[PDB]
Design a protein around this ligand. Structure first.
Ligand SMILES: NC(=O)c1ccc[n+]([C@@H]2O[C@H](COP(=O)([O-])OP(=O)(O)OC[C@H]3O[C@@H](n4cnc5c(N)ncnc54)[C@H](OP(=O)(O)O)[C@@H]3O)[C@@H](O)[C@H]2O)c1
Ligand SMILES: Nc1ccc(C(=O)N[C@@H](CCC(=O)O)C(=O)O)cc1
Ligand SMILES: Nc1ccnc(N)n1
Length: 160
């Protein structure tokens, strides 16, 4: 196997811009950690560079056409190699970015989405996912507050 995508989405499915997203959402990061801990995480090189260090308590797998540059994580050159590096686990987590999501979404059975009520002009988007193919099985809404800069709604969808 089961492959899942986990992503934080601004308005219009924006997930990235030139620099870090202009928001502060510790609740989202706690949700991300709770749902990825003890699972392998696959990420593209740009997402790796934006996180800046290995995610603890998870097998970190970086996709890049070029040789690796950090021995604390696993480096792979193809989608199939990334999957192979995960071994036989109950669930593989794909954590970004847009180019990686595009290639893994067809193979995915589960989406963990955080919908953030932030209007951000950004060049990178989460790929189209049709409701015909994806059934919402969990939803939890939260207002912005002293710790979280925008309102956010957690959602899990499973492939119909
Ligand atoms: C204009 C429009 C859109 C995005 N952007 C920019 O692009 C960046 C974000 O893009 P993103 O979210 O799409 O990045 P991302 O998914 O985190 O990382 C993309 C990188 O992952 C690697 N990758 C992905 N699929 C691969 C495969 N099948 N085999 C080998 N390597 C693979 C490549 O690294 P290597 O390059 O090392 O091969 C690729 O350049 C931002 O800097 C954004 O501003 C600019
Ligand atoms: N695109 C990002 C994804 C994850 C994180 C990150 O720092 N996550 C911590 C969570 C921080 C915490 O709640 O302690 C983790 O998963 O362990 C940062 C950027
Ligand atoms: N991939 C990511 C990064 C941050 N937050 C969530 N929910 N997903």
């Amino acid at each position: 196997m089961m492959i899942s995508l986990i992503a934080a989405l601004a308005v219009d499915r924006v997930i990235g811009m030139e620099n870090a997203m202009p928001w502060n959402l510790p609740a989202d990061l706690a949700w991300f950690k709770r749902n990825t801990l003890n699972k392998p995480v696959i990420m593209g090189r740009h997402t790796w560079e934006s996180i800046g260090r290995p995610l603890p308590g998870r097998k970190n797998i970086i996709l890049s056409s070029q040789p690796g540059t950090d021995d604390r994580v696993t480096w792979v050159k193809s989608v199939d190699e990334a999957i192979a590096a995960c071994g036989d686990v109950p669930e593989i987590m794909v954590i970004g970015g847009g180019r990686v999501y595009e290639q893994f979404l067809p193979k995915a059975q589960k989406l963990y989405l955080t919908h953030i009520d932030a209007e951000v002009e950004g060049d990178t988007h989460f790929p189209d996912y049709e409701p015909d193919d994806w059934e919402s099985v969990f939803s939890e809404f939260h207002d912005a507050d002293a710790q979280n800069s925008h309102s956010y709604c957690f959602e899990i969808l499973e492939r119909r």
